[PDB]
RNA sequence: GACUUAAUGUCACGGUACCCAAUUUUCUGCCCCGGA
RNA sequence: UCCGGGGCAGAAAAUUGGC
C-alpha cells in the first residue's frame, strides 16, 4: 500500500532550479535538467530553499527498471506474465505527457492470456498506471492505482550548502577542444544524498514487480543510487588590508603579490611553519632580516603578524586560513594596482530469444602516474543560484567539500567515450537534444556503461604549477603571461568503478580497460582531466578485478545486493570467496595482446619516447615562491614536486626534484619553433603551421604530451643541492651593487657527476614523418646543448651534456705594447695604483633593431666556443656555500674561510664570473653603457652618482631606446643575452698554491677587502664619473704570500678571508655558447675572450691584490646552421669586429683606438712569457703610522688625498690613465 | 499536508571545463680610503 | 685631538591573456 521508500545517492547528483512546466521552457538550464533533482526557493531573496526529486522522475526510473526486469525474464516476473505496456498517447485523444520518451523501449513477446483493461491488468500495466482514474491532469491522490510522491531531501537550507555550480564540458574528439559548455549544480551526497518519498500502490498484483524495480534503479539525477523500502573572511580582509598598507609604507606594493603567492603555498607546510618559526630568517647578521617575512607591519615583523593572524584565526583550518589570506592579500593588491544546453517516435526493441544479459562490474584503482589536473571554475563563479578579475589561482583543481581530489563521473566518462571512440576506430560527436538515439558504436556502448565519481582518500592541498609564456622575440617572459595551476600529486589513487549492462562484454571496452591498465610491461594510459599536453592526468588502472552478475538466472541477487552500488569499495577489498551470491569473477577477460581493437587503435595511439637528460651543470628550474617558505633561505631554489605514495598512503617525505613538464614542453616547442620559423608568427589563430600541428594552438589540442623530467640521479649526490652565490659588480666601483647580491640553489650538477633527468613524451598516431623529424631534431637540439633547462642558462645553469634515448622508443697573435712606465722602470721601484678607470667617453651606440630570438637566422652565427682558461696568477674563486669551508672558524671565530668553488668535488669556475668579467670587458671594448651602476649612491654631494654619470652611459631600460652592444650581446631585463657562458671545469696544472706557513697549505689568508670609495675617484662635485674600474695584472699576491704570518696577526680575523687558491698554470675549460650573433659580434666576443698574447683578464677575488690573472685561449670555435671554424675564418671574424669599433669611433692593431689602447694596457700582463718586469701594484696606506707602510715613501692617502700636494684634477687624470706612477 | 511532481513515454551516465603559453630575463661573491 | 671600519645580501619586470 503506502510504501515509504528511501533514495540515497553514492556520488554527487545533479541539481537544478525548479520551474513549472509552462515556465520550464523559458530557461535552458531547467529544460536540460528535467531528469535531475529539483530546487525550489523558500521564502524571499533566493537564498534558501529545499531540494527534491519529482515522483515523475522516480516513476520514470522505476518504469525503465520494470522494462529491463521484464526483458530479462521474457515479459514475466515471478510467474505472472506481462504485456508490452503502452508508451504512445494520441494528440487527438488528449494532451501529451510532460516528458516524451526518446529512447528505445525494451519489448518482449506478449504471453498474457487476455488483454489489459480497467477490470484486469498485468503488473506492467498496473505500475504504468494505464487504467486508473488518474491521468495527464492531476486532481487528487487516491485516483492513482500507483502514486509516486515527491522525494523530499532527508536532512531553511541554502543552495551553497547543498550544491556547487560546476561548469561541465563537451570536448570535440578531433580538435581536443571544448565545442561548448554547460553548468550543473552537483549536489553533495555525503550530507544531502538521502531522499525520502512515498509510493502508493492500490493493486497488490504488481507489488513484487514494484519493489524489485526499486532495487533495480541504478542511477537517478546523474548519480548511482539504492532505493530502499522503509565572518572570518571580513577580518582576514581587514588584516590583509593592514598588511598591504604597511607594505605600501615601505614602497613594497609589488611584494604583496609575492606574499599572496607565498601565503597560498603555506597550506602545504602545515601550521608549524608559522607556529614553530620555520620561515627563513634572513642572513646571519642582517639587521633588516628577511626581505619579506621581516617587513615591519604596524611596527612588528611579518612573521609575528602572521603568528598573530593564525592565533586569531585558529578556529578555521590552516588550509582555509592560508587560502583566504593569500586570496585577500591578492584581492587588495588588485585595488591598489559558448554556453549551450540540449517528431517523437516509439521504438520497440526486443532482445533475441535465449540471450544472456550480464552486468559486468569493473572495480579498479585509478593511480595518477603523472601529476594531474581536473578543471573547475573559480569559487566566485562556482556559486550556485548566482548565475577587477579576482583569481588568485588561475586554475583551481576540482575538490570536494572535504577538499579531497575528485575525478568526476563526467570527466571519467568523457575520457572513456574518447578512448572508446579511438578503440572502435569511428564514432560521433555527441549531438545534444536529438529526438533519435545515436546509432554509433560508441554511443551504443556508452548507453550500456555506468561509472562512478571517484575521490581520493587524500585531502592535502594542491601543488601550484606556475607557468609562463616566453616571448619569442626576446626570450624573456611575455608581457602578461604568468599564471598558476592547482595540480594533484602523482601516485594518487582513485577508486575506479565501471559497470557494463549488456549481452556480451564488448571487445572495444575491454581494450580501453587494458589500455588504461598499468600492469607490468606497458604504462597506464588513462588520460583524464585537462592540460594533458603538459602531462596533467595520465592515470594508471591497477588492482583490476572484473566481476560479472548473471541477470537472467540470478536477477533477485542483483536486486538484493542493489548491484553492489556504493559498495564497490568493499568489492575491491574482499576476497574471492567473500563475494555476494550471484556475483562471479569474470575469468573470460581478454588479455592485453589478444585484443583486436587495443593492438591497432589504442596501443599505437600515443607512442612513448622516454629518454634521460644528462645535465653536467647546476640545474635551476627556479621555484621562488617555495624559496620564500622554506628554511634553506635562498633567493631561488630548484623545483621539486610532492609525490604521493600508495604504500605509505601519504606524500613521500623527500620531494622529487624535476624540470617541469611545462618547461619540458616549452623547450621542445621553442626548439621546433625556431627551427621552423613558426615561433616568429605574430598570431596563431586558425594556424596550420608545423609547430601548431604538433604542439596545438588555441583551436586544436596538441599531438604531443610532455611529462615531467624526473631526477633519477639524486641518490648518488652527497650534497644534491649546491649553494652558488651571485652578485652584480658596479662598472665604476669594482665591488658589489647597493642591492644586487643573491644566491641560487640549483641541483649540484657537474661534468663528472651529472644529473640524470628521466622524462618522457607521447607522440600521437598520425604524426607526419616531417613532424617526427622535427621532434627528433628538437630532441637533438637539447642533446647538443642549444636549450638549457631552467633558469640562468646564459650563466651556465641547466646545460645538457647529452641525451640517452631508451630502448623501447687557435691563438691570438696580437701583442699590445703595454705601458712605458713599467718598461722604463725595470728595477720595480715604481709603484702603481691597483685599479685605474677607463674614460671611454659619452658616446654609446644603441641598436634599436633588436635581434630576435624567435629563429636561428641564416646570416647570423650560432654555435659554441671551447675556451681554455689558463691562470697566470694564483686564482681565487671562493666556495661561498660554506663560510667554514676550510674548517678553521673554531680557532678564528668570524673569519670567513672558503674552499675553491667546486660542484661534487671537482674544481669549477661558475660561468657567471666568466660571463660577468667578459661582459665587463665587452662593455669596455664596445663603449657600451654602465649596465650595473649605482645610480642611487650619493657623494660626500649636490647630486647622486647617476647624476654624475652621463645619460648615454646609464643602463639600458627597455628595448624602445635601443640596446648598447654589451647589453645587446649579454642581455637586459627585457632581452635574453645571446651568449651563454658555461661553468669552467678543471683539467690540468699545478692544482694548489702551496704555502708552508698556512694551516691549510693550499690556502692563503688575504689582506682585507673594503668597499670601493667613489669619493677618491670623484674628489669634488665638479668632477664626473672617471669610468670603468679595471685592475692591473701584477704579482702582488707574492707579497701577501710572504706576509701570511703578519697578515694573520695584525689584521682582525673577521675582517679578511682565507681561501683555497689555485697555483699559476692551472687550466680550466668553459664553453661559450652563442646564438644569432653577428659576423662582427662573434669576432668581438672572440677578441673579448683572447685579446692578445700579453693581454689577460682579472677573475675572482683579489683583483687589486694581483690574484686571478686568467688567460683565456680558444681551443675550437664550432658553429652550426655543425662545423669547426678554421683559423682563417676566426681571424676574419675578429677583423670585422675591429671596423665596427672604427665606425663607432669615426692583423688588427687595437692600440690605435684610444679607449681600447687604455683598456688593453689596463689588462696588459708585464710578467708574461720571457719578461723581467715585476711592477709593484698596491693601494696606499692612510698615514705614516699605519701598518704596511714603507718608511721614506710618500705613498699615503694623507698626502695623496691632500689637495695642496696632489690637486683634485691631477688625481683623476692619475686615476684615468692606466699604469700611472703613484709613488 | 503544502512547499514541490504528474502518470500509457525523461538516452542527460546525451556533453572531459577542454584548448593554447619554458618561473623566466639581466646581474663577475666581489672589494681601500678615510671617520669624528 | 684621534685609530680604524665592513658593505650589499636581492633590484626591476611580468601575476594572466586569447579561443
Ligand atoms: Mg493513470
Ligand atoms: Zn498489460
Ligand atoms: Zn554516438
Ligand atoms: Zn602556428
Ligand atoms: Zn646597456
XYZ file of C-alpha atoms (C1' of nucleotides) in Angstrom, chain A residues 11 32 34 86 88 96 98-99 102 150 169 180 340 375 410 413 418 451 531 533 622 663 665 670 697 702 727 731 734 833 912 915 972 1010 1031 1179, chain B:
72
model
C 28.111 10.157 -5.897
C 18.246 20.285 -19.714
C 14.354 17.666 -16.341
C 1.851 1.182 -23.770
C 2.037 6.150 -27.007
C 0.654 14.516 -24.393
C 5.033 16.239 -19.897
C 8.018 14.011 -20.743
C 13.224 9.288 -26.940
C 7.764 13.791 -4.446
C 32.020 20.398 -20.820
C 30.530 24.307 -25.823
C 24.817 25.534 -24.635
C 39.475 21.712 -14.276
C 31.617 13.289 -16.281
C 33.000 9.248 -18.902
C 37.013 9.427 -26.258
C 30.654 4.767 -13.988
C 46.282 20.083 -19.598
C 49.723 18.109 -23.218
C 63.518 28.106 -10.050
C 59.241 23.551 -19.111
C 57.044 21.038 -23.289
C 60.694 26.570 -28.750
C 47.093 26.062 -30.639
C 48.431 19.133 -29.020
C 76.475 39.313 -7.332
C 81.181 49.088 -13.567
C 84.802 47.306 -8.535
C 97.597 52.042 -8.214
C 78.511 33.869 -14.073
C 80.142 35.969 -18.238
C 68.945 43.215 -20.324
C 86.958 47.111 1.758
C 92.520 46.021 -12.027
C 96.990 50.648 -2.518
C -0.077 18.062 4.477
C 1.680 22.137 1.356
C 6.350 23.985 -0.291
C 7.059 20.557 -4.853
C 5.635 16.404 -9.419
C 2.167 14.321 -12.873
C 1.275 9.301 -14.547
C 0.324 4.920 -21.049
C 6.529 7.671 -22.723
C 12.766 11.959 -19.040
C 19.141 8.062 -23.686
C 21.071 13.985 -19.845
C 25.962 8.315 -17.278
C 23.468 12.746 -24.148
C 28.256 16.780 -23.003
C 36.214 15.535 -20.175
C 35.899 22.870 -18.254
C 38.761 21.462 -22.534
C 42.364 24.073 -25.876
C 46.873 27.019 -26.248
C 51.734 29.544 -23.046
C 59.804 27.221 -20.907
C 59.059 30.931 -13.471
C 61.821 33.112 -16.766
C 65.027 37.762 -18.375
C 69.559 40.900 -16.658
C 73.458 40.767 -12.889
C 81.749 38.802 -12.047
C 80.794 36.926 -4.004
C 83.025 40.997 -5.308
C 86.056 44.817 -2.872
C 90.695 50.910 0.223
C 90.174 55.379 1.953
C 89.115 57.758 5.416
C 85.955 58.519 10.232
C 84.653 62.184 14.252
